[PDB]
Structure 1
Amino acid sequence: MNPFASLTLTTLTILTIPIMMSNSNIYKTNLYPNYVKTTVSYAFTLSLVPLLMFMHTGQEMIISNWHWMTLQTVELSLSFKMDYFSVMFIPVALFVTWSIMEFSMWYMHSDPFINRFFKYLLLFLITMMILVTANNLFQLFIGWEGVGIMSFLLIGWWHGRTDANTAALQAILYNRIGDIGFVLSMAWFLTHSNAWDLQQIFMLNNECPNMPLIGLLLAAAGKSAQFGLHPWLPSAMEGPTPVSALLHSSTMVVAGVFLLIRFYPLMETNKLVQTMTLCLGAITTLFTALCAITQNDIKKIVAFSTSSQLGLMMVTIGINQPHLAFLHICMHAFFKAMLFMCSGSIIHSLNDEQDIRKMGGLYKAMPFTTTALIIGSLALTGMPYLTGFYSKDLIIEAVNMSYTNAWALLMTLIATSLTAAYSTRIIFFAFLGKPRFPPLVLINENNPLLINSIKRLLIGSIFAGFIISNNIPPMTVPNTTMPLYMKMTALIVTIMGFMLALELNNTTYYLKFKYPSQTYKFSNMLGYYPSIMHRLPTYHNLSMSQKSASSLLDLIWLETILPKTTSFIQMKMSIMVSNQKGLIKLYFLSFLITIMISMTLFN
């Protein structure tokens, strides 16, 4: 046998191993975080090997190892799809998870349940690998709901915090609407194609219809926090910073984009769903960047950046470029994870402070995190030869050179400018200027765990784009010929965003005070979407649940119709029958009437 299947399954299995050891003296000791981190490192190397095997000859396989059950003519089995997407995303996810686990070993040092934290991180990684490698819709759904519930558990890490509990339930609610879409798609595919596996689905759906493709689009919007279903992702910043860095921003929110990428044959066949995907992505990226440019919480700014980048990926899928979307998934994983880790380092060094209004002077106070965050923000905005150039620049070129929605193209360009803008805001308000933090300076970023984790994710944010771009096969025809101004569109809008944001931020020093604008209030309060749409529909649903269902119907009218009315009638008739004075005159007269009636009316 070739080592491809063995090594892929080995990576997955050795990921599962430390969960088995979560009932041992090692789980009772303080070596468990280091044990889990070492396991993830070894899994990362063993995943690097089949990536080299694919990068040579483009080797892909499917492994239907275990047969689960046969529903007459439908066979469900445990099958894994080890193709380009899986063998590229597994090493990236493992690398990011390894760095995040080391940073969490430093960051969650005082947590009484750090071992449980690491077990939960490993469980999320397992579910995400199941999602990515799944070859059938049922196993994909297992991974889907697994990452959803692990996100729920990790957001509500501090159970005494009411805000944390509301954020966890909110994430569940939005992902559950997404799951409504997912289940609609599963039912359609089984009913009309007799299969839940991608091979038969692709073979039988020569032209996929609107109903299954819109089901998939709705599920992806829910899982990837697109507009309409977006507010849960910024609200998921209640959990510990390692959770925000690993789960949401880098590896879990890309689940919807990955779902849409995995069905790119059907997506190619359809066109209306492509238009809907493009428009949804465009409005998501614009709206979330616009909300980001004015937030004062660093984690919130990074979360809205994540939503904006996901919108960009959804735009890329909508222009019939699924492989560019996957490339952006990988590059964004790298630099967004690093940005979240730097934000967490700043938060920890300033006594759990997350307000850029109280950060300041950190350029010189914290050298290594300063340079790491600068490199990450440059890579995010598309510096000409960093890891974000090889995906975002090509995405912008493809959007400009396609038969696209004009409004979608305009919103995409404006969103690129706003990306530069809010990256400028983070840097300007956190690192430049005079200090604003309380006078007891506890700044210390000299821990080897923190430095090494950021260093590993920092090398990737510089060179990994070049390596990956030059080692993957050409899966799309390039845009070789285009106007020079259209070639330089991304750089021009990025620099314009930098300059305008810098001017606006420098204006803050003037001794001039002006009341805020309506546009400022709209952007700062998230477009008023969480207020209106978290107070009105919830209030009406919870009011109907009691006034109409519980009280009016169950306690009042369903009780009155059958059992209350019947009981009342029987009681009244009983009173009528038994209310007799016991007078022989009366009931003998009754006997006489009965005898006459029987003689006359019976023949």
Structure 2
Amino acid sequence: MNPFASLTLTTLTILTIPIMMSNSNIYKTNLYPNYVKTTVSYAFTLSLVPLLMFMHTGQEMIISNWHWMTLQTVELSLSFKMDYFSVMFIPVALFVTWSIMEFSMWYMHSDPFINRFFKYLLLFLITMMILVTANNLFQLFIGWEGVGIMSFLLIGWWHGRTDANTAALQAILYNRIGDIGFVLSMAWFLTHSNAWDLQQIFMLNNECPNMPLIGLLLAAAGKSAQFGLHPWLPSAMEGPTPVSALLHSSTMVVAGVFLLIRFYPLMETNKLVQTMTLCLGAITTLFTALCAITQNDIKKIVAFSTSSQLGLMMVTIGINQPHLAFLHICMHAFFKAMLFMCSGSIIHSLNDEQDIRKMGGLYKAMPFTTTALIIGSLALTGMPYLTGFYSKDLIIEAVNMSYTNAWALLMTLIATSLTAAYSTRIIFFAFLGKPRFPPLVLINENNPLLINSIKRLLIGSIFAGFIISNNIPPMTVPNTTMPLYMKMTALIVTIMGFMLALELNNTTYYLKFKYPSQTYKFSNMLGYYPSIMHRLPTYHNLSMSQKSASSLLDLIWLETILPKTTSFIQMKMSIMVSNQKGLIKLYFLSFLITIMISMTLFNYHE
């Protein structure tokens, strides 16, 4: 039999073995994190082989191995899709997870529940693999909700902290709002196509209507934190830094984009939904890049960077370039995870300080970290012939050379400049100048785990772009002819972002003080979106939940109409009937009245 299927299933299966051993003796030892990391490294090495098979012959497969249940005419089976997207994303995710687990072995060394932390990371990885390889909508929903629940558990890792629990519940709330659209798409595809698997859905929908695609767009907006449902990703920085590096930067947050990539045959036939996706991505990327340039927490800046890159992924979906969007996912994973680990090393060295205003000159004090973050910021800004270039350069060219919304294109270019702006902000404030941290200097990056994990993702961020670009078949018609100024536009706007940000950062050395502008206040306070939307709707909903639903209806009026009215009426009737004084005169007078009435009203009618 073909080794392809066996290897693809074994790569996923072996990741579950430490979960089975979580009740064994090794889980109570200090060797469990190393065991989990070694298992993930072996899984990555194994998954490298189906990738080679696909790069050789373009091999793709679907495996329907276990029949779950049959609902008259709808068969639900455990089926895995092993197309280009799955076999390309699995090794990238495994590589990033391997680096991040090696990093976590050093970052979380003193945590009393480090074994539980590694188990939780493995559980998230398993759920995300389920999401990526799913062939029907039910399995994909299983992966969707699994990654959501693992995100909830890892954001609220320090469960004695109120802010962590609030952030975890916020993430749940926003992703549930997206789940509404996911469930709408599922119901539509079942009642209209009589299927949940991708094959029949593609066969039966040649002109896909608006409803299922809009549901999918809502689910993607929730999962990838687009402008309507954006605020939960920055607040997810409450979790430990490895959680931010793995889930909320490079792997889980792209899931929504991945969903739109899974259904691109249906989406390319609908232009309204394509325009909606493009506009949502454009406003998202520019708004989040605008918020990033004034933030002072390093994790918050990198999280807003992640949101802006997801917005760019959505705009390249909107111009009908799904393969380019997937390529950007794979490229951005490397350097965004590396940037988060560099931030984590800085934070750990400076006694868990995350504010860039207290980070001084680390260029010489943390040389390897400085080198890695410089290379990562260069990859993020699209420096030529780096990992981000082969992805970002093409996306900008495709938006420039397409029949597209003009406002969306302008917003994308401005966001491209703002990317270099906030990268400059991070580098200038964290690594240049004079120290601004407390005088007891604890700076130490001489740990082999940290160095090796950073080194691995650094080699990735340097060469993966070239390797992956030259080792895949052409899925697109290339833009070979364009005006020269349009060819150089991305570099030009990046240069402007660099120069303008550097000038404004250098003016902070002058002995001049001025009160802030209103535009600065809008940028720093996140467009006031969490100040209004996290207070007004929540207050009104909870207020109506108590005053109207609980008290006015259940405790008052529903009591009043049925049971209290009955009790009152029966009590009054009982009092009226039973209050007879016992005098026979009154009784016998009533008897006479009764006898007369019976003689007149019944006895006269026969």
Deviations 1:294-337 (A, max 9, x none): 00000000000000000000000000000000000000000000
Q: Distance in 1 between matches of 2:437 and 2:381?
A: 28
Shift of 1:581: 0.2
Q: Distance in 1 between matches of 2:28 and 2:388?
A: 42
Deviations 1:45-83 (A, max 9, x none): 110000000000000000000000000000000000000
Shift of 1:130: 0.1
2:527 alignment partner in structure 1: 527
Q: Distance in 2 between matches of 1:24 and 1:17?
A: 11
Q: Distance in 2 between matches of 1:208 and 1:459?
A: 43
Q: Distance in 1 between matches of 2:563 and 2:322?
A: 61
Deviations 1:260-296 (A, max 9, x none): 0000000101100000000000000000000000000
1:117 alignment partner in structure 2: 117
1:226 alignment partner in structure 2: 226
Q: Distance in 2 between matches of 1:131 and 1:142?
A: 7
2:52 alignment partner in structure 1: 52
Q: Distance in 1 between matches of 2:234 and 2:176?
A: 17
Q: Distance in 1 between matches of 2:204 and 2:127?
A: 29
Deviations 1:489-509 (A, max 9, x none): 000000000000000000000
Q: Distance in 1 between matches of 2:177 and 2:135?
A: 23
Structure 2 alignment gaps of length 5 or more: none
1:504 alignment partner in structure 2: 504
Q: Distance in 2 between matches of 1:594 and 1:255?
A: 84
Deviations 1:181-222 (A, max 9, x none): 000000000000000000000000011110000000000000
1:202-241 map, 5 Å: 202-241=202-241
Q: Distance in 2 between matches of 1:8 and 1:489?
A: 41
Q: Distance in 2 between matches of 1:209 and 1:279?
A: 19
Provide the secondary structure at the position in 1 that maps to 2:357: coil
Deviations 1:16-39 (A, max 9, x none): 111000001100000000000000
1:391 alignment partner in structure 2: 391
Deviations 1:136-165 (A, max 9, x none): 000000000000000000000000000000
Deviations 1:409-442 (A, max 9, x none): 0000000000000000000000000000000000
1:174-253 map, 5 Å: 174-253=174-253
2:165 alignment partner in structure 1: 165
Q: Distance in 2 between matches of 1:101 and 1:444?
A: 20
Q: Distance in 2 between matches of 1:432 and 1:597?
A: 109
Q: Distance in 1 between matches of 2:294 and 2:417?
A: 14
Q: Distance in 2 between matches of 1:357 and 1:169?
A: 30
1:293 alignment partner in structure 2: 293
Q: Distance in 2 between matches of 1:544 and 1:169?
A: 20
CA-based RMSD of the aligned residues comes to 0.3
2:571 alignment partner in structure 1: 571
Q: Distance in 1 between matches of 2:215 and 2:238?
A: 30
Q: Distance in 2 between matches of 1:141 and 1:556?
A: 41
Provide the secondary structure at the position in 1 that maps to 2:452: helix
Q: Distance in 1 between matches of 2:130 and 2:248?
A: 17
Provide the secondary structure at the position in 2 that maps to 1:403: coil
Provide the secondary structure at the position in 1 that maps to 2:158: coil
Q: Distance in 1 between matches of 2:483 and 2:327?
A: 25
2:352 is equivalent to residue 352 of structure 1: yes
Provide the secondary structure at the position in 2 that maps to 1:64: strand
Q: Distance in 1 between matches of 2:149 and 2:223?
A: 12
Shift of 1:115: 0.1
Shift of 1:168: 0.0
Q: Distance in 2 between matches of 1:518 and 1:16?
A: 52
Deviations 1:211-256 (A, max 9, x none): 0000000000000000010000000000000000001101000000
Q: Distance in 1 between matches of 2:99 and 2:175?
A: 27
Provide the secondary structure at the position in 2 that maps to 1:357: helix
Structure 1 alignment gaps of length 5 or more: none
Q: Distance in 2 between matches of 1:523 and 1:3?
A: 54
Shift of 1:570: 0.1
2:82 alignment partner in structure 1: 82
1:451 alignment partner in structure 2: 451
Provide the secondary structure at the position in 2 that maps to 1:269: coil
Shift of 1:563: 0.1
1:315 alignment partner in structure 2: 315
Q: Distance in 2 between matches of 1:379 and 1:357?
A: 25
Q: Distance in 2 between matches of 1:467 and 1:86?
A: 18
1:155 alignment partner in structure 2: 155
Q: Distance in 1 between matches of 2:314 and 2:121?
A: 27
| TM-score of the aligned structures, taking structure 1 as reference length | 1.00
Provide the secondary structure at the position in 1 that maps to 2:476: coil
Provide the secondary structure at the position in 2 that maps to 1:523: helix
Q: Distance in 2 between matches of 1:463 and 1:28?
A: 39
Identity %: 100
Provide the secondary structure at the position in 2 that maps to 1:253: coil
Q: Distance in 2 between matches of 1:587 and 1:105?
A: 96
Shift of 1:120: 0.1
Provide the secondary structure at the position in 1 that maps to 2:228: coil
2:513 is equivalent to residue 513 of structure 1: yes
Shift of 1:113: 0.1
Shift of 1:594: 0.2
Provide the secondary structure at the position in 1 that maps to 2:516: coil
Q: Distance in 2 between matches of 1:135 and 1:24?
A: 33
Shift of 1:595: 0.2
Q: Distance in 2 between matches of 1:330 and 1:428?
A: 28
Deviations 1:551-573 (A, max 9, x none): 00000000000000010000000
Q: Distance in 2 between matches of 1:442 and 1:123?
A: 34
Q: Distance in 1 between matches of 2:539 and 2:5?
A: 52
1:312-461 map, 5 Å: 312-461=312-461
Q: Distance in 1 between matches of 2:132 and 2:104?
A: 24
1:484 alignment partner in structure 2: 484
Q: Distance in 2 between matches of 1:512 and 1:248?
A: 39
Provide the secondary structure at the position in 2 that maps to 1:63: strand
Shift of 1:389: 0.3
Provide the secondary structure at the position in 1 that maps to 2:540: helix
| TM-score of the aligned structures, taking structure 2 as reference length | 0.99
Q: Distance in 2 between matches of 1:347 and 1:400?
A: 39
Provide the secondary structure at the position in 2 that maps to 1:79: strand
Q: Distance in 2 between matches of 1:535 and 1:287?
A: 21
Provide the secondary structure at the position in 2 that maps to 1:70: strand
Q: Distance in 2 between matches of 1:333 and 1:468?
A: 13
Q: Distance in 2 between matches of 1:466 and 1:302?
A: 25
Shift of 1:355: 0.4
Shift of 1:586: 0.4
Q: Distance in 2 between matches of 1:436 and 1:3?
A: 57
Provide the secondary structure at the position in 2 that maps to 1:364: coil
Shift of 1:398: 0.1
Q: Distance in 1 between matches of 2:472 and 2:568?
A: 80
Provide the secondary structure at the position in 2 that maps to 1:69: strand
Deviations 1:335-387 (A, max 9, x none): 00000000000000000000000001100010000000000000000001100
Deviations 1:495-532 (A, max 9, x none): 00000000000000000000000000000000000010
Provide the secondary structure at the position in 1 that maps to 2:102: helix
Q: Distance in 2 between matches of 1:268 and 1:167?
A: 36
Q: Distance in 1 between matches of 2:59 and 2:37?
A: 29
Q: Distance in 2 between matches of 1:433 and 1:461?
A: 27
Q: Distance in 1 between matches of 2:280 and 2:310?
A: 11
Provide the secondary structure at the position in 1 that maps to 2:383: coil
